[PDB]
């Protein structure tokens, strides 16, 4: 059940303004692993958008995708900070990439999304 921890190794800058599939190349240490452990967190305050953003996180091997999701629910105008996170395992596939896609772009205003690889085996 054990694995090699990478601490909070950022995977990259997450765009808040697109619903396109965002690609991140894995750090080289993880490129020989069989599985990767990732941590995705988000927060939204007085947002510029409203509605559910199911953020899709996945690796792929050919046509096969290995998908996880995280809810971000911006609500424009609110005077509070909402926040969510999840940490989950994905197969480390031959293209050495991991993907993130917003289903609704939450906007940059008063919001954030941070994406890390925290381990591998
Ligand atoms: Cl965040
Ligand atoms: Cl919340
Ligand atoms: Na929350």
From TrEMBL:
The lineage of its organism: Bacteria, Pseudomonadati, Bdellovibrionota, Bdellovibrionia, Bdellovibrionales. This is Cell wall surface anchor family protein. It comes from the Bacteria.
